[PDB]
Write a protein that binds this ligand. Structure first.
Ligand SMILES: Nc1ncnc2c1ncn2[C@@H]1O[C@H](COP(=O)(O)OP(=O)(O)OP(=O)(O)O)[C@@H](O)[C@H]1O
Ligand SMILES: Nc1ncnc2c1ncn2[C@@H]1O[C@H](COP(=O)(O)OP(=O)(O)OP(=O)(O)O)[C@@H](O)[C@H]1O
Ligand SMILES: Nc1ncnc2c1ncn2[C@@H]1O[C@H](COP(=O)(O)OP(=O)(O)OP(=O)(O)O)[C@@H](O)[C@H]1O
Ligand SMILES: Nc1ncnc2c1ncn2[C@@H]1O[C@H](COP(=O)(O)OP(=O)(O)OP(=O)(O)O)[C@@H](O)[C@H]1O
Ligand SMILES: Nc1ncnc2c1ncn2[C@@H]1O[C@H](COP(=O)(O)OP(=O)(O)OP(=O)(O)O)[C@@H](O)[C@H]1O
Ligand SMILES: Nc1ncnc2c1ncn2[C@@H]1O[C@H](COP(=O)(O)OP(=O)(O)OP(=O)(O)O)[C@@H](O)[C@H]1O
Ligand SMILES: [Mg+2]
Ligand SMILES: [Mg+2]
Ligand SMILES: [Mg+2]
Ligand SMILES: [Mg+2]
Ligand SMILES: [Mg+2]
Ligand SMILES: [Mg+2]
Ligand SMILES: [Mg+2]
Ligand SMILES: [Mg+2]
Ligand SMILES: [Mg+2]
Lengths: 235, 235, 235
């Protein structure tokens, strides 16, 4: 019989290479910020970076992906300072899920949800603000998952609603960095050239799906990404 | 009497903590580039960063915040190379004010106003250009101010017109860095991870106000930012 | 006679200063990514940076510079997952030319052409991807040129089509760094402040020309940039 062939041994080694690839320092960290929309559609901000990412997604970036929009924004910019007839935008998301596939340094993950002008935790003066907020380092709150990548340590999910605890009309700061358990830094003087040369790969993608089911089958599953659906099931 | 209570002593200390917070290395540097528009409205580019900022705002970013616009741009891109019927855009600003609240290294502030393609000081060949221009390091030209933050050393204002000395149809490069009077660098090998992790917080905001009075009362005053109005009065 | 005057000696020295200026570490590296469009127009992405550049141009950035566009994008995002009636976009480019004027480190030039989501070389899983691709480091494949800058070593051109070998509906990652033949790094701890302070100058420009002839005479020639026209002639 061919019950334990050299062909099969080779595959087994290749399986391990594939499963451990996220730990490869020249791989990507993959983060997906899923935003759940008022018409039941999903908007996924898909980000891949080798080493680090730091970007604040504006209300405009989140809501797309005229004078009426402007009048509305006026009211988000200044309390009681706009002439809009509606309290909230049809285009704002109602909930979110941040999911990760990569060797992330969990202590480096920042998710700060603020108002239109990026004010978070009710702290509304530029002079009082700092880069370290209350609801900010979500690392400890990220759950593990089963699904395709069950039993690995490089998938994590965190979700919530856009309610008054954070903001109902949001901008969202997201940052993260790749883990390093070894002594030599990838930001060391020897490596800064590379940290910056590859800093732009890739640009965030804004992916609209007709509903969560469509998101799962047209993107999550075929791209082999982790995901927790609204019923709690991990893929 | 309660003429000098422990309650009041505590407040006094808190006042000092607040007043000195801009010096806190985990605070934000706040810069506002106010642009004065041809319909009397104001467009404020509001920027907060912990450590550094470097971005060239394009004509498109400044003028927003079709084929007619394109024909016009053609003429800015190449002398006498476009078919537009107008000499300038209704959407271009006529004057500007850069104001700062933060422990800025004044020698690090660059404001370079160029034409559509970012050519400054009449130097129009990419091969001749450098990152150091004539009208560029505005530090020495920044004035102090009174107003809310009178008697502090971390507010500064600089203004001017968009005329032929710089450009009447502008793009604008703005960079700055936080001061450091101490020996250990925030770009040191130990700190580069952080310099880049927080580099994106926050995104620039583009804030449109109906007029300068509205800007002052709906944004400057309630956000506790410094500002010099068109009559020279500091807030 | 005035056959060899001090006036002429001065000019000769100035000619050398000008010709060698690209080697000046405070000059710009200039890169132009020319994209050739289906209506015969050209779109030039014009980039100048002092030290490094790293950005992935999205399909949206390339194609500009509604529900129909969305339905089309759906199909690029997921195989057979969109309802569009057309196979390709009228707005996609058909070929490209990357040309450089600057003291580029040729080993630092990355040009990775991927599909809508930035997948390159047929590798379509985020977990399998790395920052080093097959068709990626184009340095060795860049040709020298004659034209204005004949006999210099700081001009290079590389071109190709957007076909199935790369992608017919592309996003494009472009990175590069300035050469350094000396011992002290411009990313060294002493210099990181500067590497980042000037990192944003300039923003990429998206320049539309009516045809290649117009591109050459309205931009290439008067800006003194190198260029190879469709007949192989260098300017
Ligand atoms: N001195 C204090 N004693 C008790 N509670 C406080 C005190 N200061 C703030 N809090 C409470 O802490 C919570 C968060 O307040 P906040 O985020 O404004 O923090 P803070 O300590 O006041 O910081 P800052 O000086 O930047 O305003 C609020 O519930 C607030 O009432
Ligand atoms: N190359 C690596 N770099 C960083 N971490 C690693 C690497 N290889 C393994 N690890 C860590 O060790 C853990 C276990 O690895 P591995 O799967 O090889 O062991 P195992 O015997 O199958 O036991 P386990 O049930 O923990 O997987 C991984 O989940 C990962 O967090
Ligand atoms: N050799 C020179 N002698 C006197 N004036 C000069 C000389 N070169 C330039 N200038 C003057 O200096 C001013 C600025 O010129 P410009 O910004 O082009 O500087 P530059 O010294 O010529 O630099 P570059 O070599 O980059 O062109 C102009 O008024 C110009 O006439
Ligand atoms: N923690 C700090 N970091 C950096 N600079 C500081 C710090 N504290 C004070 N300074 C500098 O010293 C100046 C004076 O500080 P302070 O207000 O404590 O002194 P003062 O006795 O009230 O006199 P002054 O009239 O200068 O304020 C400040 O304006 C500031 O520029
Ligand atoms: N073990 C192998 N033996 C022979 N050819 C291979 C092998 N693996 C891949 N190839 C071939 O190499 C070419 C490129 O494949 P690909 O880019 O997927 O590289 P790869 O080595 O399989 O990397 P990865 O493990 O990331 O998929 C293809 O023509 C493929 O058929
Ligand atoms: N300052 C510099 N920094 C970096 N490289 C330089 C510098 N000066 C010259 N070189 C390199 O040396 C080459 C030749 O320089 P130069 O033109 O001064 O010599 P030449 O005698 O005219 O011979 P050639 O025919 O090589 O030009 C240049 O093409 C360039 O690549
Ligand atoms: Mg292999
Ligand atoms: Mg408080
Ligand atoms: Mg395991
Ligand atoms: Mg306190
Ligand atoms: Mg000159
Ligand atoms: Mg004082
Ligand atoms: Mg000179
Ligand atoms: Mg393979
Ligand atoms: Mg020579």
């Amino acid at each position: 019989m061919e019950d334990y062939t050299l062909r099969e041994r080779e595959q087994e080694i290749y399986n391990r290479q594939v499963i451990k690839r996220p730990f490869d320092p020249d791989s990507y960290l993959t983060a997906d910020l899923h935003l759940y929309l008022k018409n039941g559609k999903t908007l996924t901000i898909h980000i891949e970076r080798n080493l680090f990412f730091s970007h604040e997604f504006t209300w405009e970036e989140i809501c797309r992906g005229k004078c009426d929009t402007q009048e509305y924004i006026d009211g988000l910019v200044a309390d009681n300072g706009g002439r809009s007839t509606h309290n909230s935008s049809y285009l704002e998301p109602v909930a979110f899920q941040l999911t990760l596939l990569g060797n992330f340094d969990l202590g480096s993950i920042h998710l700060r949800i603020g108002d239109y002008l990026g004010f978070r935790d009710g702290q509304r003066f530029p002079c009082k603000e700092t880069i370290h907020g209350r609801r900010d380092t979500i690392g400890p709150f990220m759950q593990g998952m089963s699904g395709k990548w069950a039993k690995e340590d490089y998938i994590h999910t965190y979700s919530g609603r856009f309610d008054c605890k954070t903001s109902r009309h949001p901008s969202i700061f997201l940052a993260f960095m790749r883990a390093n358990q070894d002594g030599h830094s990838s930001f060391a003087p020897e490596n800064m050239r590379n940290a910056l040369l590859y800093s732009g790969d890739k640009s965030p993608r804004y992916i609209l799906m007709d509903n969560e089911h469509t998101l799962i089958n047209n993107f999550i599953i075929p791209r082999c990404l982790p995901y927790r659906d609204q019923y709690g099931k991990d893929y």
